[PDB]
């Protein structure tokens, strides 16, 4: 089973700011210190900032989110999903806890409004937002081909409509795929000590 | 310039249309009646004539 992706949110945020902070106490158990992590170049190489005065296309940002790995849904309620309705694109960043609407205007970011999971209306408008990749691993075509290369190098393929190799190559994500993480970076993963 | 070639497609199509006319008449006279609350387009359409 997946790590219950909501938790992943609370994780990635702490990871993103972790190098840059002077005072504060972070507590970890050993059972998770034992676990390897991402390189943070994958992280902050994909760390987008949306600002008011930007003439950015709705569709360009849409494909940008798709590459980042956000899932297209129509009634956004969770972490890491985006929905569209005419000129109104809304999504939920993986770092923050509240989704946002945009109110595109001539391919310009006119508004950036927080809204509750059940109000579906403006609570306030924030000047800018920062968003992070959907998961703890890339999911673009390069990622898929690298994963398949590593797989064919290490394990043995089975021609089967649920073998995770074929399931991944299809485009979807296996439920427990998060445990097959080292097959996405071609590098020894950091011990988090860095 | 006054005589027309009428190959197999056209003749068969016309025979099919003259077949359809009969079922059209049957369904028209059927719908003329009341009691349409339980009809289906299966009993009124007959496969034998076409």
């Amino acid at each position: 089973f997946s790590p219950h992706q909501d938790i992943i949110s609370s994780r990635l945020s702490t990871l993103y700011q972790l190098p840059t902070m002077q005072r504060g106490v972070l507590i970890v158990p050993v059972n998770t210190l034992m676990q390897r992590v991402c390189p943070h170049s994958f992280l902050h190489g994909h760390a987008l900032v949306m600002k008011k005065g930007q003439r950015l296309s709705r569709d360009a940002l849409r494909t940008q989110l798709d590459s980042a790995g956000y899932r297209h849904v129509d009634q956004v309620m969770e972490h890491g999903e985006y929905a569209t309705r005419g000129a109104l694109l809304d999504l939920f960043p993986m770092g923050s806890e509240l989704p946002y609407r945009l109110d595109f205007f001539d391919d310009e970011i006119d508004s950036l409004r927080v809204f509750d999971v059940d109000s579906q209306r403006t609570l306030e408008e924030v000047e800018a937002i920062n968003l992070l990749p959907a998961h703890e691993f890339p999911t673009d075509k390069a990622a898929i081909e690298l994963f398949r290369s590593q797989w064919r190098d290490t394990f043995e393929v089975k021609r089967d409509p649920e073998h995770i190799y074929q399931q991944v190559s299809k485009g979807t994500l296996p439920a427990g795929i998060e445990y097959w993480q080292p097959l996405f970076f071609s590098e020894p993963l950091p011990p988090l000590f860095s | 310039g006054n005589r027309r070639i009428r190959s197999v497609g056209e003749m068969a199509e016309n025979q099919f249309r003259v077949g359809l006319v009969r079922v059209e008449r049957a369904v028209k006279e059927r719908l003329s009646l009341g009691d349409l609350d339980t009809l289906m387009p299966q009993d009124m359409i007959n496969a034998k004539p076409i």
Binding site: E145, R148, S149, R152, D153, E156, V157, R159, S169 | -
Partner: protein, 50 residues
């Protein structure tokens, strides 16, 4: 019997290999059902005039 999973460098060639293996499995299924279809056609009875 064991050729279609040998290693190969990462490129469209691997894609072709996967496509061919898929085709092979599909062909097996096609044959194994077409045989049944022919059996059904043969062994059944025969329509006849009264």
């Amino acid at each position: 019997d064991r050729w279609l999973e040998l290693g190969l460098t990462d490129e469209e060639k691997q894609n072709q290999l996967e496509q061919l293996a898929e085709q092979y499995d599909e062909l097996k299924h096609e044959f194994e059902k077409k045989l049944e279809a022919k059996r059904r056609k043969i062994t059944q009875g025969d329509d006849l005039a009264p």
